[PDB]
Design an enzyme around this catalytic site. Structure first.
Site, short mmCIF file in Angstrom:
data_model
loop_
_atom_site.label_atom_id
_atom_site.label_comp_id
_atom_site.label_asym_id
_atom_site.label_seq_id
_atom_site.Cartn_x
_atom_site.Cartn_y
_atom_site.Cartn_z
N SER A 96 12.78 -3.78 -8.23
CA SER A 96 13.82 -2.82 -7.92
C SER A 96 13.72 -2.32 -6.48
CB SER A 96 13.74 -1.64 -8.88
OG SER A 96 12.53 -0.93 -8.70
N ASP B 50 2.98 -3.31 -7.70
CA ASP B 50 2.68 -1.96 -8.14
C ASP B 50 2.28 -1.98 -9.61
OD1 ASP B 50 5.12 -2.55 -9.21
OD2 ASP B 50 6.09 -0.68 -8.61
N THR C 160 9.11 -0.73 -9.95
CA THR C 160 8.38 -1.99 -10.00
C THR C 160 8.64 -2.81 -8.74
OG1 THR C 160 8.44 -2.08 -12.42
CG2 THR C 160 7.98 -4.13 -11.24
N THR C 161 7.59 -3.43 -8.21
CA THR C 161 7.71 -4.21 -6.99
C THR C 161 6.62 -5.27 -6.97
OG1 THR C 161 8.69 -2.38 -5.77
CG2 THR C 161 7.74 -4.19 -4.51
N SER D 124 9.22 2.52 -8.28
CA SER D 124 7.90 1.94 -8.08
C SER D 124 6.89 3.03 -7.75
CB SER D 124 7.94 0.90 -6.96
OG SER D 124 8.76 -0.20 -7.34
#
Lengths: 238, 191, 228, 232, 240, 240, 146
Positions: free
Chosen positions: B130, B17, B1-2, B170
């Site tokens: 992350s 994302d 995840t970003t 991600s």
């Protein structure tokens, strides 16, 4: 009169007669007067006795080192709100480690008395609280009421026949800034002697004197150290 | 995840994302990380899922009602103030990397950062998630003050591109949004 | 005929407590005397029937070993105040290792002298005389339902309390002695009562600095009646 | 509030309940309606008039379902009805949660009447101003009960509330019999409905629901007007 | 008649009446105002005048047209206190709806909540019954425009066009003969009729400043308040 | 009579003689008026010294709620103090939760609701106070609100309170108000409040003056009163 | 205020009063007479009485605030031999919630009070005692205050 029973009831003229009655409750107590110099605050109270062998009821009561107050009217409310006061002083005394300035303390008193003056089934407090002490900027003299109307006065008198007592104040109020404790105290007590019969004034059993000064913690005197203050007086004319 | 957020002159631009995982399983390919709180206020969420979703719902509640009473547009600083209130209030039970953004009439585009701690801060651009630790160098030298909107789009596009490439957490697809005084423009990309 | 129990007079004093003071007038009388030698106390029992056991009725009750009590009015109501009185003093010693002073106690009692209400009852209906020697010598205080707490040298209350205080003022001076105040008191007792004074109508209580306890076994009573 | 809690309903010196006695009056002053249970189900019909032609009819509703097999109507003042309606809504739900089965009808009359009676004995609140009628084909045999402001209830083969409930009462005693069918009972119910209704009786001048052993159902204005043929 | 305290509290009369609420209905009449609402084929409009006796008294701070939600408009009568206090109730449970159920609240449902709340104000015998009146409008999916009236008594009902204020009987008399004669309702149809009924009941020929006009229509469901420019456009529009 | 007792009982005509009494009860107090120029708001109040009665400057009715929020109390005093405490507490909550200055509209509305709370029960009476609300902003400008005992509250460009009220507002509208500077309006009101209370009624009164707005930088403070002293030099030239 | 009133009383009173209204204002007005009326309570009257032309001007009477009290006492203290050391301001501020009648009455009682001791002039104490008599003191034992 039927609308003259409870506190919540207004008046068709717009005057809740209950508080008006509580104002009557204060008029019955003994007399007492307070005032202050530019640098000192002094208040004297008159004692009364139920009978001869019975002592005279005390009026002045210490609260804090810089806070002194008188009393008038009932006594239950006296001890109650007094206990609230001693509580409040040591509160910020414990929190900020500093004395309580007189003003916002007094406002706390009025806020305290506000609620039972409006909620159902709650009498007002019959009392004539007079207040004296120092903030960081000199002495102060505040008077109270069942209506909770704190007044930043220069000198007042409440109780039995304080009407004439006030009169002596104005004609010497200009003198009430330059004189120090010695003549100032006798200035004040000269005003009590008119609130009495013409045959007994101060006979070392019916008077008390509370004081607060710059380097002077609030002190109380009664009938034994008052004697030195009781001297140097002119009798009443006629 | 970003998650990616940058403000520019006309307004602000957000993106992230779409990849949602669990342990070492891809629970979801594509996912709406962005959130439309108000018509000019979005938020990108990160960390726990149910935490961010529920918090988003509640904040949408209070902000929505309060705006209706206001009879006026809400303030982005106000909205971020709410998330600071809740997150700091229950910091012992939440894992949120919320970043708030949106265009304001009184102040144009605004971006505010809300890390897991509960602090609040405004920035010229904020990033989270992350894989977000993988792109500090590129985002720093890559950034240049006073860009245009489309410049912001290509900027963030390359950013989340590199992050999605390097991170194993991600991935998925790139979601992008842009807010200005006019409206809201959303789109999905690849490359 | 049903107004507020917490409303002031139109003249401004009160509604019910004014009645409360009125209720004490119908109670038995009692007299106390504070002497530099010590403090003495007396009260009439007001016996009704010979089948009625006399000693089961009492007015003098101890709160502490050096603290006596005197009540007049609603006895059972007085009982609660007695119990709290003992309790808080015991708190004082079991928190300070010293004896609470006489006045200081009656402050504590008179705190809830007026606390009836709705949230959080009615006022009380008994008057009290408290005697007890402390660091300031023998002490004698008097209270009322209105919480008005005050000290007196030699107070008398009850039904005939008017003539009691009146004649008593005629007979008291500062330098009294113990037994002198005793017989002086009982003379007022016989003058105010109606039943023939004997070993059952009345009762005393004597606290002394040396005689630290109050001790009034009977037939010393008779010993004084024969002396009177 | 403050917590006064003191009941406003006391017994008369004669030994009567003045407030309940008055509430029964306002109940009698309500709109008329009637219901019947004849050998297959129950039918409920009301007296619904719009005071003006500007009202909507598909908005307000009188014959109200509680469960798929339980219908209820009322006679009194409209507003107080809806409260106890919702209350019965929940109350029927908790039973189903406990036992996982549709609550029997008599249980509802038990619990609802308990709520109303307790509400009568409570402090500082007037009793309700509506009587109620309940019907449902629980286990083949349908049932038809009546409540009242006093919290009581009964089991009526057929009866009517509102105005002239005694005249329509006798009319039900004569025209009614032991057994009938649903349609016939509808015919007599509309008979007593016209017994006190206004001049024109249309699909909107009344409204009718029914219980069947296949479950509770409401009637639409279509079949209402369709049944209006062969009036009374 | 008076028996016990039926004249004083929320209890039953010997006749079965209760005098308090019926005292409350005319308690709205002291507002010195009359409101009008109308529903059209695809739109609904509110309108009501105002009284600005002071030049020192602001203009925008007099409106009774109260936006509840993006698709819900309402108007008030009676006393301003009970009205405004009613407002936060409406807005409040309105938002609570969205929080609990996601989608938007039905205008009829909200009227249910308000009437139910008002029910207890009469039901308990220790609470003033909030003598004001409530008016709502809003578009419904698969239902078009809707208008409702909440009362201090605690009941409601749909309509097609309705007024309130002080001239209920007159405006209703005008509207009944006005609508039932097979009236096709366009936007300016419903509007022009709205201005006309009021301007006939009061016989004003008002300037476009005094009156206020709320509006909702199924082309932009956003509840909309009219500007005096366009309001004047409609005023001269009916001004042949 | 027989109905004016409670605050929860409607009169047989539809009002509340409690609030009826309380309003005129506030009417009997001295006069306190307020106005607002284009870039600020000014408060003026007449106080009455009885004979000596206090150290001057005591118990001023010109309160101060926020750094940018000004009060103007009248009627009863203590209840006004309680109200000021309520407002200060309220704005403290707003700042606490949301972190910026409270809008005058929301503040006055909240206070209005809280006032309305004490008009629906027998347990409490209504208040015996009224007041003003002065605020200024760079993003909002000058806003002035007014609150009655009943609970009505809204804005003005000017308003008056006290015995001399209608006569007071008469010449008030005589002034231009749009373009005026509050500094001029200061000396202006001095003529207003010095052409009111006279002899054979009360005694030597007192003229206090609050002043907020642009020049005050949004901060509320009292006028420099002894400073520049043009109220009196300007509040006397009305000898003829 | 008329109402559904039964057999007697009103059944001639409102007849006479209506004759008063019609004979006062309306049919055949006149200008050669002026009407002054006075009452105590206002709420019983009818609208036609107080319409705007039957009774034009309404005058309320508030009691003496301070100086009206002091001066009224100074007015009935016009015919009495007064020791010229007397503050009518003290007298006013101690005279609370009185009327012109009562303020007159205190000045009345003071002269007789001084007549008790046969004095010629007066004293502030005299006025005080008269105040006490006018106030109707009840009792004693009010001593557990202060």
């Amino acid at each position: 009169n039927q609308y003259d029973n409870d506190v919540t009831v207004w008046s068709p003229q717009g005057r809740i007669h209950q508080i008006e009655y509580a104002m009557e409750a204060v008029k019955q107590g003994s007399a007492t007067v307070g005032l202050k110099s530019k640098t000192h605050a002094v208040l004297v109270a008159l004692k009364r006795a139920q009978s001869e062998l019975a002592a005279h009821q005390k009026k002045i009561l210490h609260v804090d080192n810089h806070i002194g107050i008188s009393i008038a009217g009932l006594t239950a409310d006296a001890r109650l709100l007094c206990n609230f006061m001693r509580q409040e002083c040591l509160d910020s005394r414990f929190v900020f480690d500093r004395p309580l300035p007189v003003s916002r303390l007094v406002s706390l008193i009025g806020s305290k008395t506000q609620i039972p003056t409006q909620r159902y089934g709650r009498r007002p407090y019959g009392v004539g609280l007079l207040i004296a002490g120092y903030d960081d900027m000199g002495p102060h003299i505040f008077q109270t009421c069942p209506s909770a109307n704190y007044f930043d006065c220069r000198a007042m008198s409440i109780g039995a026949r304080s009407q004439s007592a006030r009169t002596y104040l104005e004609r010497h109020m200009s003198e009430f800034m330059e004189c120090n404790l010695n003549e100032l105290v006798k200035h004040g007590l000269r005003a009590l002697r008119e609130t009495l019969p013409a045959e007994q004034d101060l006979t070392t059993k019916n008077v008390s004197i509370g004081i607060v000064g710059k380097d002077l913690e609030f002190t109380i005197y009664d009938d034994d150290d008052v004697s030195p203050f009781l001297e140097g007086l002119e009798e009443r004319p006629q | 995840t970003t998650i990616m957020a940058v403000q520019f002159d006309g307004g602000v631009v957000l993106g992230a994302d779409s990849r949602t995982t669990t342990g070492s399983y891809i629970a979801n390919r594509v996912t709406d990380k962005l959130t439309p709180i108000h018509d000019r206020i979005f938020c990108c969420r990160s960390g726990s899922a149910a935490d961010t979703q529920a918090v988003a719902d509640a904040v949408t509640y209070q902000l929505g009602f309060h705006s209706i009473e206001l009879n006026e547009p809400p303030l982005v600083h106000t909205a971020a103030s709410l998330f600071k209130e809740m997150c700091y209030r229950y910091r012992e039970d939440l894992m949120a990397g919320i970043i708030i953004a949106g265009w304001d009439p009184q102040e144009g585009g605004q971006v505010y950062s809300v890390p897991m701690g509960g602090m609040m801060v405004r920035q010229s651009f904020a990033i989270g998630g992350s894989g977000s630790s993988y792109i500090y160098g590129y985002v720093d030298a890559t950034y240049r003050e006073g860009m245009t909107k489309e410049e912001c789009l290509q900027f963030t596009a390359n950013a989340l591109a590199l992050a999605m490439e390097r991170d194993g957490s991600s991935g998925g697809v790139i979601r992008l949004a842009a807010i200005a005084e006019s409206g809201v423009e959303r789109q999905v990309l690849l490359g | 005929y049903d107004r507020g129990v917490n409303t002031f007079s139109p003249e401004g004093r009160l509604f019910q407590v004014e009645y409360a003071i009125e209720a004490i007038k119908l109670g038995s009388t009692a007299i106390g005397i504070q002497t530099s030698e010590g403090v003495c106390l007396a009260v009439e029992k007001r016996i009704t029937s010979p089948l009625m056991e006399p000693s089961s009725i009492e007015k003098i009750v101890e709160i502490d070993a050096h603290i006596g009590c005197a009540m007049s009015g609603l006895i059972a109501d007085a009982k609660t105040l007695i119990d709290k009185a003992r309790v808080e003093t015991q708190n004082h010693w079991f928190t300070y290792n010293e004896t609470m002073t006489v006045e200081s106690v009656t402050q504590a009692v008179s705190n809830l002298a007026l606390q009836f209400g709705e949230e959080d009852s009615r006022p009380f209906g008994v008057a009290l005389l408290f005697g007890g020697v402390d660091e300031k010598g023998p002490q004698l205080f008097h209270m009322d339902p209105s919480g008005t707490f005050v000290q007196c040298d030699a107070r008398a209350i009850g039904s005939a309390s008017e003539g009691a205080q009146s004649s008593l003022q005629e007979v008291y001076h500062k330098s009294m002695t113990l037994k002198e105040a005793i017989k002086s008191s009982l003379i007022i007792l016989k003058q105010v009562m109606e039943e023939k004074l004997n070993a059952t109508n009345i009762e005393l209580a004597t606290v002394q600095p040396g005689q630290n306890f109050h001790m009034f076994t009977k037939e010393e009573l008779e010993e004084v009646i024969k002396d009177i | 509030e403050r917590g006064y809690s003191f009941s406003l309903t006391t017994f008369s010196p004669s030994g009567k309940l003045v407030q309940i006695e008055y509430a029964l009056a306002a109940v009698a002053g309500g709109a008329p309606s009637v219901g019947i249970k004849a050998a297959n189900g129950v039918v409920l019909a009301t007296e619904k008039k719009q005071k003006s032609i500007l009202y909507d009819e598909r908005s307000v509703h009188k014959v109200e379902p509680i469960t798929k097999h339980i219908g209820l109507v009322y006679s009194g003042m409209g507003p107080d009805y809806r409260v106890l309606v919702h209350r019965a809504r929940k109350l029927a739900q908790q039973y189903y949660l406990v036992y996982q089965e549709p609550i029997p009808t008599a249980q509802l009359v038990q619990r609802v009447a308990s709520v109303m009676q307790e509400y009568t004995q409570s402090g500082g609140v007037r009793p309700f101003g509506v009587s109620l009628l309940i019907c449902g084909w629980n286990e083949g045999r349908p049932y038809l009960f009546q409540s009242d402001p006093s919290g009581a209830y009964f089991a009526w083969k057929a009866t009517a509330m509102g105005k002239n409930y005694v005249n329509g009462k006798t009319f039900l005693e004569k025209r009614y019999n032991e057994d009938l069918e649903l349609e016939d009972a509808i015919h007599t119910a509309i008979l007593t409905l016209k017994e006190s209704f206004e001049g024109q009786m249309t699909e909107d001048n009344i409204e009718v629901g029914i219980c069947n052993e296949a479950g509770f159902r409401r009637l639409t204005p279509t079949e209402v007007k369709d049944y209006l043929a062969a009036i009374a | 008649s008076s028996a016990g305290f039926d004249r004083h509290i929320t209890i039953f009369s010997p006749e079965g009446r209760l005098y308090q609420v019926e005292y409350a209905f005319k308690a709205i009449n002291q507002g010195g105002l009359t409101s009008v609402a109308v529903r059209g084929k695809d739109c609904a409009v509110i309108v009501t005048q105002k009284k600005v006796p002071d030049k020192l008294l602001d203009s925008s701070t007099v409106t009774h047209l109260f936006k509840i939600t993006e698709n819900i408009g309402c108007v008030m009568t009676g006393m301003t206190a009970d009205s405004r206090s009613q407002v936060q109730r409406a807005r409040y449970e309105a938002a609570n709806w969205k929080y609990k159920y996601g989608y938007e609240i039905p205008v009829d449902m909200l009227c249910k909540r308000i009437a139910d709340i008002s029910q207890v104000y009469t039901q308990n015998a220790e609470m003033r019954p909030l003598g004001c009146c409530m008016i709502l409008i809003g578009i419904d999916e698969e239902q078009g425009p809707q208008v409702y009236k909440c009362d201090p008594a605690g009941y409601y009902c749909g309509f097609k066009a309705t007024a309130a204020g002080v001239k209920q009987t007159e405006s209703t008399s005008f509207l009944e003969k006005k609508v039932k004669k097979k009236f096709d309702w366009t936007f300016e149809q419903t509007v022009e009729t709205a201005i006309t009924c009021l301007s006939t009941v009061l016989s004003i020929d008002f300037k476009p400043s005094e009156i206020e006009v709320g509006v909702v229509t199924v082309e932009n469901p956003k509840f909309r308040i009219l500007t005096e420019a366009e309001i004047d456009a409609h005023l001269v529009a009916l001004a042949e | 009579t027989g109905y004016d007792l409670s605050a929860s009982t409607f009169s047989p005509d539809g009002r509340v003689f409690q609030v009826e009494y309380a309003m005129k009860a506030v009417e009997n107090s001295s006069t306190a008026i307020g106005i607002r120029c284009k870039d600020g708001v000014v408060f003026g109040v007449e106080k009455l010294v009885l004979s000596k009665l206090y150290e001057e400057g005591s118990n001023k009715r010109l309160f101060n709620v926020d750094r940018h929020v000004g009060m103007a109390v009248a009627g009863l005093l203590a209840d006004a103090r309680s109200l000021a405490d309520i407002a200060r507490e309220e704005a403290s909550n707003f700042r606490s939760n949301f972190g910026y200055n409270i809008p005058l509209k929301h503040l006055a509305d909240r206070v209005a609701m809280y006032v309305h709370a004490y008009t629906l029960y027998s347990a409490v009476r209504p208040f015996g106070c009224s007041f003003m609300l002065g605020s200024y902003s760079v993003n909002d400008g000058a806003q002035l609100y007014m609150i009655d005992p009943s609970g009505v509250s809204y804005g003005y460009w000017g308003c008056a309170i006290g015995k001399a009220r209608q006569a007071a507002k008469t010449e008030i509208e005589k002034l231009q108000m749009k373009e005026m500077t509050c500094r001029d309006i200061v000396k202006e009101v001095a003529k207003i409040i010095y052409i009111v209370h006279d002899e054979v009624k009360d005694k030597a009164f007192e003229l206090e003056l609050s002043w907020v707005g642009e020049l005050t930088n949004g901060r509320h403070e009292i006028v420099p009163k002894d400073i520049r002293e043009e109220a009196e030099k300007y509040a006397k030239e009305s000898l003829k | 205020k008329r109402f559904d009133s039964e057999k007697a009383g009103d059944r001639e009173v409102q007849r006479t009063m209506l004759e008063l209204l019609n004979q006062l204002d309306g049919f055949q007005p006149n200008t050669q007479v002026k009407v002054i009326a006075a009452t105590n309570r206002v709420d019983i009257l009818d609208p036609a009485l107080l319409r705007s032309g039957r009774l034009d001007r309404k005058i309320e009477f508030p009691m003496p605030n301070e100086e009206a009290r002091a001066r009224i006492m100074q007015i009935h203290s016009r015919k009495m031999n007064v020791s010229p050391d007397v503050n009518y301001e003290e007298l006013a501020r101690c005279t609370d919630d009185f009327n012109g009648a009562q303020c007159k009455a205190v000045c009345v009682e003071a002269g007789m009070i001084a007549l008790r001791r046969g004095a010629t002039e007066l004293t502030h104490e005299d006025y005080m005692e008269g105040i006490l008599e006018v106030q109707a003191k009840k009792k004693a034992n009010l001593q557990y205050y202060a």
